[PDB]
């Protein structure tokens, strides 16, 4: 996508000077019960070379849920970026309510965004094929993260459905060496996580490269303002 002059303009306005706390997009918008928000300060973490913060990540993951529904793409559940550290630190009981009113096992793909010491990565849980994969643009392994996530699934299933998983029919993958790393910039780690999640959620092979990130950051500022993926 080469961008419109007006697109460019609105993107430059959203990233330029003004009140850091000014709310630029909310999903669902006023009046709705809370309510993801993006302020000017958060949307500035999309300036090139800046690291994305949790508010950008969660807002974008959520646009993927809406988009998947509108396009006939697979049923997508995305967890908060706060879900995994809370589960790692405090166990199933601490997060059991974070799926209230949802039957996780009637979805098809689950995305778990993972913030690690200094970078973003992603776990995809593919319910159709009983598979978990850890995608990390700095090439780290996450078979530990995955096993914690699989345990959570058995714990959800036993609690919410009173049934057990057979964890033997379930399998971990970490990517092979050339399935898209870039360790040169953990600045772009959050963009990789969001694009990984965008393609994975559509069953689309992951073919973009590092060269596209600056354009993807500008596109994502417009997507967030307009709550619509391009």
């Amino acid at each position: 996508l080469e961008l419109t002059e007006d697109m460019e303009k609105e993107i430059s306005n959203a990233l330029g000077h003004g009140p850091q706390d000014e709310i630029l997009s909310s999903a669902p918008p006023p009046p709705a019960k809370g309510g993801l928000r993006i302020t000017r300060g958060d949307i500035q973490t999309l300036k090139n070379y800046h690291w994305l913060n949790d508010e950008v990540i969660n807002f974008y993951m959520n646009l993927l849920v809406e988009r998947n529904k509108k396009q006939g793409y697979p049923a997508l559940h995305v967890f908060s970026t706060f879900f995994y550290p809370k589960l790692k630190s405090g166990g199933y009981q601490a997060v059991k309510r974070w799926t209230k009113g949802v039957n996780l096992f009637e979805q098809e793909i689950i995305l778990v965004p993972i913030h690690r010491k200094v970078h973003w990565s992603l776990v995809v849980i593919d319910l159709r094929k009983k598979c978990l994969k850890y995608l990390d643009s700095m090439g780290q392994k996450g078979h530990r993260i995955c096993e914690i996530l699989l345990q959570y699934l058995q714990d959800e299933s036993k609690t919410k459905r009173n049934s057990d998983l057979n964890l033997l029919e379930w399998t971990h993958h970490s990517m092979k060496p050339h399935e898209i790393p870039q360790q040169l910039n953990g600045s772009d780690s959050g963009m990789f996580t969001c694009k990984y999640a965008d393609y994975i959620s559509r069953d689309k092979p992951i073919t973009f490269t590092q060269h596209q990130m600056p354009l993807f950051r500008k596109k994502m500022v417009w997507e967030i303002l307009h709550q619509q993926l391009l």
Binding site: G34, R37, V95, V118
Partner: protein, 81 residues
């Protein structure tokens, strides 16, 4: 109709609150940062994983008495200069 709510920090601490079910949660949030010496912009309040906004009310988010709110620090890798 006051409701008690628990606010749980990541350092394990727990600050209790009694508050009107139709008062905006911002009153709660500000008291919390001031008390903990925290910066509002650096922290997130969540109710079972979902955003609570200053403008939100407990009734509007259908909290019940005794419920727990989490506070998390922002997650950001780095600082560009």
């Amino acid at each position: 109709d006051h409701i008690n709510l628990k606010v749980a920090g990541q350092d394990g601490s727990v600050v209790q609150f009694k508050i009107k079910r139709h008062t905006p949660l911002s009153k709660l949030m500000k008291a919390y940062c001031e008390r903990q010496g925290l910066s509002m912009r650096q922290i997130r309040f969540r109710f079972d994983g979902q955003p609570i906004n200053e403008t939100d009310t407990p009734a509007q988010l259908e909290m019940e008495d005794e419920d727990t709110i989490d506070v998390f620090q922002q997650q950001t890798g780095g600082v560009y200069l």
